Structures are given as structure tokens and as C-alpha cells.
Swiss-Prot record:
This is Maltose/maltodextrin-binding periplasmic protein. It is found in: Periplasm. The gene is malE. GO terms for biological process: carbohydrate transport; cell chemotaxis; detection of maltose stimulus; DNA damage response; maltodextrin transmembrane transport; maltose transport. GO terms for cellular component: ATP-binding cassette (ABC) transporter complex; ATP-binding cassette (ABC) transporter complex, substrate-binding subunit-containing; maltose transport complex; membrane; outer membrane-bounded periplasmic space; periplasmic space. Part of the ABC transporter complex MalEFGK involved in maltose/maltodextrin import. Binds maltose and higher maltodextrins such as maltotriose. The complex is composed of two ATP-binding proteins (MalK), two transmembrane proteins (MalG and MalF) and a solute-binding protein (MalE). InterPro entries: Maltose/Cyclodextrin-bd, SBP, SBP_1_CS. Its main location: periplasm. One of its GO terms (molecular function) is maltose binding.
Length: 472
């Protein structure tokens, strides 16, 4: 990274052009150039380049990633005076605190809502259970009831959590990273409902963000599920849409994960002063947040003034109604593992490649004990040796990645076994989606032969190991 300027990363669905306007104001006033970029997979690339001392000066993402970044020494501690803290809501500062330190600036509060075409559907269904029958009606006139992104677990999690799914159990003031709530009866019920919607052809397992967005904004489907950033494009489509409560499932509300868009400062930036100035006195103002929101709505911004100004907007009100019914995302480093786990499970259940029960059990194991890192042509799998929480440590020789042709390098620590594998050699399965090439294999723990009687929790366990790379 180079000093005298600022490089900013932010996701491509956010208002990066408005942010660039803020940067242009900054530049004119101070002479310091600001370059805003939106690389794909930036939440995964940032730790890779920041660990070598490179990467952007500022990284934007929902707060849930930042704990990992902070645990890895990648984030500078931020030091706002008391007055600036008084300018933002306490909930948001809470979201960006890790081990008693502030590790990023809160920007805005995000939550999914149900977005619906008022002309096609004047009265949105209050329950998921209605949607199959409703779909029938709409299918009779060449339309669908619901389409939304099924490739990212962020969008399916509300249904999964409604009847009792959860990420990590919060207990005694801390999250128990071995107590994952993706494999309980409620999560299984929610995912079964989703997979049923697919099997009965009310939804297609391949639908992604762009497909669902195009369908809804063209008037081909009566509903979608999305956050404030999407509203802009809908406005341009001139569809007459409303933003409202997500449907219930078995009488309980959908529970979306509440995100807080946050901006962290790279620990290796030589421009930490400039970054603080830009964030506090340029972006986190009525003018800055106004520009960014005008591009792609931010939601309920953390700055009290502009949030009070925008609360009249009923869409913000529905976003916050849904947020209240949901849970704030943890920011612990294990969230990435959680997300990988659920992602894989959902896809594999939606395709029918795996049952719901098996997919969610494997996701429990993956979130609790496995970390997948996908590199150019190589894969790294890190397995917790305390695989079942018993405190009994697995031996490396009982762990196998892939089939016999897969011959990884295996390294052992006190607490983990790490597999460094060649993707071509270890891919059991390859396939293409619209947007990605997918390489897939499995991790197996099989201690047999073992002399003792196997009882209760089984010692044989198999989890999906998968990497997705953009098609270009
Ligand atoms: O799907 C897993 C993904 O969910 C969240 O990402 C959201 C993000 O919060 C929103 O700002 C918007 O970009 O949609 C994203 C999902 O595509 C988590 O914050 C992220 O860590 C997680 O991977
Ligand atoms: Ca569990
Ligand atoms: Ca696409
Ligand atoms: Ca706009």
C-alpha cells in the first residue's frame, strides 16, 4: 500500500459511486486522492493480502467478519473521542467491539425484508405455508410467487431460524463455538420446507441474486427477499413495490440475521490518520451518508441525525421491524466457518444431492471443527482435533481427505490437523453453476479398527469440502 492516498474496498452491491463522491469531496478539500474498488470475494481476499502487509487502507463489510480480522492482527484500533461516539447509536458500537476494543466504524444497520409487487399481489401472504397455493394461482397467469437468492445462506437463514435454528449458543456471556444450532428440529424443519418448495417446483435451486432481481424488477414474480441496497434498482424498474414483514413459519416469525455495515482500518496502512479523518468528518456526516444512500440505500444508518431524518421512510420501518424479530450476527472468528457450513448444506439439500438431515448434521460438524481455505489451485482444510467436544483428540492417521488419489500434505498441531491439498488431484466432483466452477470432495474421520463398543455419539464422520471459483 502507498501513502498520501486512500484505497477503499466495499462490496459491489453497495453504493460505491456515492462513496466515491464522498472521496472526491475529500480530495478537493485536502488534495488526497481516494480510490474506491469493489473486488469480488473481498471479504476473503482482504485477510490474504492484509497478512502480507498489503491490501486497502479501509475495508467495508458487515460487522460479522471483523472479529476474525481483528484476531489476525489485521485491524487498527479506532479512537473516536466521546462526542463522536455520542453521535452514533450504542447498538452499532456494540456490533463493532471485539475483546473490549473498537475495531471498526459502524455505518449502517441492515436486515432483509419481504419485497412484494403490489399490482400482482395487493395482500402479501403472512405465512410461508400459504406460498405453494399462492404460487399455483400466479402460475396460471405466467407468473411466480417468490424468487430470491438461494446460493447465499444469508437469504435462507430467516426460514431456517424461524422454528429454532441458531448459529452459536450464547451462554455465560460468551458464545459456545461448539454449540451450533444448524442441526436441530427447527432448522431441519425450515430447510425441509425450502427443499419442498423446490421439489414441487415453486422455486428453482439455481436461482441466484441476479436472477431473482431481474425476475422481480421485470414483474415476473410477485415477491423477493432483499435488503435496502436493492431498493435503488427496483425504483428504476418502476414496479409498484412494498417492503414488509417476512412470512412466518409454523406460526413463528422469520428471523433474519441483523448486519451492521462497518468500515475497518488496515493495520498496515500508512494513512490511518487520513482514514480516521475521512470516516469521522466526511463519510459519517449527513452529507456523506446522504450521497451513499442516494446511490444504494444504507438502511438505518448508525449516525443518529440522518437516521432520525430518514425514519419517516416506511421501508426503513419494515427493515427495522424485521431486524427486531431477528438476531444480531456474532462477530466471532468462527462465523466464516458457520457461513461456509450453512452455504454448503443448503446447496446440497436444495439440489437433492444430500438429505436435509445429513446436510445439517455435516454443517454442525463443519461449523464446529472445520475451516476451508480455497487457493488458486490448492486447498487448505484445518480440522479441530477436539472433533466431538469430548476433549478426546483425533489422530491424524484416522483422517482422510478425498479418495485414494488425493495425497495431501498433512501437518499436525496440538489442536488441529491441517491438509494442504492439490485441487485437481483431490476433487472428487466438479460441476458448473451459472457463475462458478465448483470443486468438491469430502473429509472423513474413521478410527476403525477400534476395539471398544461404539455407543451414543458416533466416531465416524464425513463432511463436504468444497471450493467455488468465478466463471469468466
Ligand atoms: O451469505 C453469507 C454472508 O452473509 C452476510 O453477507 C451479506 C451482507 O451482510 C449484506 O451486506 C449483503 O452484501 O448480502 C451479503 C450476503 O450475500 C455476512 O455478512 C457475510 O459474512 C456472509 O458471508
Ligand atoms: Ca448442534
Ligand atoms: Ca448470476
Ligand atoms: Ca440510487
Amino acid at each position: 500500500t502507498e501513502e498520501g492516498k486512500l484505497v477503499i474496498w466495499i462490496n459491489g452491491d453497495k453504493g460505491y459511486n456515492g462513496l466515491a463522491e464522498v472521496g472526491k469531496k475529500f480530495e478537493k478539500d485536502t488534495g488526497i486522492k481516494v480510490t474506491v474498488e469493489h473486488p469480488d470475494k473481498l471479504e476473503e481476499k482482504f485477510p490474504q493480502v492484509a497478512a502480507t502487509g498489503d491490501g486497502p487502507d479501509i475495508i467495508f463489510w458487515a460487522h460479522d467478519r471483523f472479529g476474525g480480522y481483528a484476531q489476525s492482527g489485521l485491524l487498527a484500533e479506532i479512537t473516536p473521542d466521546k462526542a463522536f461516539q455520542d453521535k452514533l447509536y450504542p447498538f452499532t458500537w456494540d456490533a463493532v467491539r471485539y475483546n473490549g476494543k473498537l475495531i471498526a466504524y459502524p455505518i449502517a444497520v441492515e436486515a432483509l425484508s419481504l419485497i412484494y409487487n403490489k399490482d400482482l399481489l395487493p395482500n402479501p401472504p403472512k405465512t410461508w405455508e400459504e406460498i405453494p397455493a399462492l404460487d399455483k394461482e400466479l402460475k396460471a397467469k405466467g407468473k411466480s410467487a417468490l424468487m430470491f437468492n438461494l446460493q447465499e445462506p444469508y437469504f435462507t437463514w430467516p426460514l431456517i431460524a424461524a422454528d429454532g435454528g441458531y448459529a452459536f449458543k450464547y451462554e455465560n456471556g460468551k458464545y459456545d463455538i461448539k454449540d451450533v444450532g444448524v442441526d436441530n428440529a427447527g432448522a431441519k424443519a425450515g430447510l425441509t420446507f425450502l427443499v419442498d418448495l423446490i421439489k414441487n417446483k415453486h422455486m428453482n435451486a439455481d436461482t441466484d441474486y441476479s436472477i431473482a432481481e431481474a425476475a422481480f424488477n421485470k414483474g415476473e414474480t410477485a415477491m423477493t427477499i432483499n435488503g435496502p441496497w436493492a431498493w435503488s434498482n427496483i425504483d428504476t424498474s418502476k414496479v409498484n413495490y412494498g417492503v414488509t414483514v417476512l412470512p412466518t413459519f409454523k406460526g413463528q416469525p422469520s428471523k433474519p440475521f441483523v448486519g451492521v455495515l462497518s468500515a475497518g482500518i488496515n493495520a498496515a496502512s500508512p494513512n490511518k490518520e487520513l482514514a480516521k479523518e475521512f470516516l469521522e468528518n466526511y463519510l459519517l456526516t449527513d452529507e456523506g451518508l446522504e450521497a451513499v444512500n442516494k446511490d444504494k440505500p444504507l438502511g438505518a444508518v448508525a449516525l443518529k441525525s440522518y437516521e432520525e431524518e430518514l425514519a419517516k421512510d416506511p421501508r426503513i420501518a419494515a427493515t427495522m421491524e424485521n431486524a427486531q424479530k431477528g438476531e444480531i450476527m456474532p462477530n466471532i472468528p468462527q462465523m466464516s466457518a458457520f457461513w461456509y457450513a450453512v452455504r454448503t448444506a443448503v446447496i446440497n439439500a436444495a439440489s437433492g444431492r444430500q438429505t436435509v438431515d445429513a446436510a445439517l448434521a455435516a454443517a454442525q460438524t463443519n461449523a464446529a471443527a472445520v475451516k476451508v481455505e480455497c487457493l488458486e489451485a490448492e486447498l487448505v482444510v484445518t480440522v479441530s482435533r477436539d472433533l466431538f467436544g469430548t476433549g478426546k483428540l483425533v489422530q491424524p492417521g484416522d483422517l482422510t481427505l478425498g479418495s485414494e488419489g488425493c495425497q495431501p500434505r498433512v501437518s499436525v498441531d496440538t489442536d488441529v490437523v491441517r491438509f494442504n491439498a492439490q485441487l485437481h488431484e483431490c476433487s472428487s466432483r466438479v460441476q458448473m453453476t451459472k457463475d462458478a466452477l465448483v470443486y468438491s470432495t469430502f473429509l472423513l474421520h474413521d478410527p476403525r479398527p477400534v476395539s471398544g463398543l461404539s455407543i451414543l455419539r458416533t466416531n465416524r464422520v464425513e463432511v463436504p469440502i468444497e471450493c467455488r471459483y468465478p466463471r469468466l
